[PDB]
Symmetry: C2
Subunit: 49 residues, 2 copies
């Protein structure tokens, strides 16, 4: 049936440090308008399945 339980981070403000663990799940604003916790245009979920 397909596995979608394995995700990976896709968007971040900056690169990670060595041995750095990032777990935050917050709506990512890639544009010039607030997302207000709404997954819409120019507002992408940081984790991709």
């Amino acid at each position: 049936g397909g596995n979608y339980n394995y995700r990976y981070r896709l968007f971040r403000k900056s690169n990670l440090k060595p041995f750095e663990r990032d777990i935050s799940t917050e709506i990512y604003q890639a544009g010039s308008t607030p997302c207000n916790g709404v997954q819409g245009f120019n507002c992408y979920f940081p984790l991709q399945s």
Copy 2:
């Protein structure tokens, strides 16, 4: 950087009728456990970019 503003459905209860339009977004239970609006384990967002 890649465009991610185009999305399509990935899960449904059944198939669409001819010339049918579905726009409703809702958590899809790919298992046997209620999800109540979480993209966790066996609970998948219907759309994919």
